[PDB]
Amino acid sequence: MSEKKQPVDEDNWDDDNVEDDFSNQLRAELEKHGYKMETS
């Protein structure tokens, strides 16, 4: 404005929530998905 308080101090986002779920969980993932095969 700049008056008063402030001088004192589809889209891809909806799916980017789920991507954030993929970031902290199960990586992507390829390698682990391929490593779980020979474990048992």
Partner: protein, 480 residues
């Protein structure tokens, strides 16, 4: 030396053009606006005055120094002089100094020279009509002067400027009082100046007595004359009272009123931000979520700069305690992202059902939360993380074992497995029925009531809001 020597002359006349005609056309226009119409107010040059103050506050302010245009501080504060027919000759004197600065070098007098200068409106004897024009001609050098921040010996001149402004305030309270109209143009200035009071007092000492003065002013506005002033005074109160314990929480309920009409526009919404943090301390989110969201949607268009981003920093806090939170990178700003990185990892681990993931973020990133004073949420948010985990596991599993559920949520023992669910049922978190023999926990999915109650409750907000859009459209449509 030749290059810079020839680059010194061009700059100073650029302000000496615009800044000379700026408050002469705005102040001199508001001079005739103050004699009549005077409806409301309006005084549209008061809004133009907001634009002009913000105009110099980017470029060029007042000074410096600069050893060129620093003579404008005594220039405009001299020569009222005195009555309107005598002011023509003085308006010409303002232009004679242009030839003085064009022929010889410009004279710089500031700092200790400002003491008689600020007392020259009292020496001229007098303006004599417009206290706000003298308050503007005295403040306009003083307001950007705070940008020096030299802190040595000129801050007591800012105290002398509050004293001289208090003289102009005694003249503001005694004179007029019947269709004042000088007060309504001065309430913007009493606002800005009181915010500059707290600005200067933040660099030295908090103001305990100036709040006695401020509250004298505050309560004395009601009922005699309050237009736009008290809405700002309440925010002055709230601003340092939110930083300084205590009781100020329930102080707002006895102040309201509201206070209507909401002014100035966004200036009211930020008030909703201050009271949003306040009402968050009472842990009521439903009242807090609306006041937070309204703050952001009621504030256009920026820039600047970071406070509009900080109000959003605290916006999603109450929603994180709610348990229902949208992903916050839709509001992501290139200047904001870099600031909330640690904070963003916080909400990232909050929405998850892992408790250890959440306890790591407080350890590593608590150092940033110390500066924001946001630890008030970090104790009460744990309740929401456990409630989130149990909600997930409730809908995602038909029948769950209480002993085997503790390993995933690091619940660590069988006994609290019963406790979380006990309060979950008590708060209506889960409808499942639990049998204690081994024990086990079974859950059931009930519906069909569903769209009976929930959509009609929303419709009550939807339709009322749509007819309000109709009323607000009719209001602005009938003006022509």
């Amino acid at each position: 030396p030749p290059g810079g020597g020839e680059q010194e002359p061009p700059p100073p006349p650029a302000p000496q053009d615009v800044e000379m005609k700026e408050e002469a056309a705005t102040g001199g226009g508001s001079t005739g606006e103050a004699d009549g119409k005077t409806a409301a107010a309006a005084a549209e040059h008061s809004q133009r005055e907001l634009d002009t103050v913000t105009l110099e506050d980017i470029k060029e302010h007042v000074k410096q120094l600069e050893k060129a245009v620093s003579g404008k501080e005594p220039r405009f504060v001299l020569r009222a002089l005195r009555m309107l027919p005598s002011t023509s000759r003085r308006l010409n004197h303002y232009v004679l100094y242009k030839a003085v600065q064009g022929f010889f070098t410009s004279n710089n007098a500031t700092r200790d020279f400002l003491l008689p200068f600020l007392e020259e409106p009292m020496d001229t004897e007098a303006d004599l009509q417009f206290r706000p024009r003298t308050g503007k001609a005295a403040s306009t050098p003083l307001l950007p002067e705070v940008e020096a921040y030299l802190q040595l010996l000129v801050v007591i001149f800012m105290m002398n400027s509050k004293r001289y402004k208090e003289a102009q305030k005694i003249s503001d309270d005694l004179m007029q009082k019947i269709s004042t109209q000088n007060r309504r143009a001065l309430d913007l200035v009493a606002a800005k100046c009181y915010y500059y009071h707290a600005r200067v007092y933040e660099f030295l000492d908090k103001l305990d007595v100036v709040r006695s003065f401020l509250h004298a002013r505050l309560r004395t506005a009601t009922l005699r004359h309050d237009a736009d002033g008290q809405a700002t005074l309440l925010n002055l109160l709230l601003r340092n009272y939110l930083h300084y314990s205590l009781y100020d929480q329930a102080e707002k309920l006895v102040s309201k009123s509201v206070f209507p009409e909401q002014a100035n526009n966004n200036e009211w919404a930020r008030y909703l931000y201050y009271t949003g943090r306040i009402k968050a301390i009472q842990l009521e989110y439903s009242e807090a979520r609306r006041t937070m969201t309204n703050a952001l949607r009621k504030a256009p268009q920026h820039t600047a700069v970071g406070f509009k981003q900080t109000v959003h920093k605290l916006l999603i806090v109450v929603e994180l305690l709610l348990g229902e939170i949208p992903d916050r990178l839709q509001f992501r700003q290139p200047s904001l992202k870099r600031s909330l990185m640690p904070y963003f990892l916080l909400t990232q681990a909050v929405r998850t059902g892992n408790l250890a993931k959440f306890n790591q973020v407080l350890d590593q990133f608590g150092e940033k939360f110390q500066a924001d004073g946001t630890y008030t949420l970090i104790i009460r948010l744990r309740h929401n993380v456990i409630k989130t985990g149990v909600r997930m596991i409730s809908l995602s599993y038909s029948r769950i074992s209480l002993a085997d559920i503790a390993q995933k949520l690091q619940l660590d023992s069988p006994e609290d497995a019963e406790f979380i669910v006990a309060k979950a049922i008590r708060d209506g978190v889960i409808e499942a029925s639990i049998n204690h023999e081994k024990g086990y926990v079974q859950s059931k999915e009930m519906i069909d009531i569903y769209s009976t109650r929930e959509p009609q409750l929303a419709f009550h907000q939807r339709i009322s809001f749509c007819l309000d859009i109709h009323n607000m459209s009719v209001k602005a449509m009938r003006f022509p």
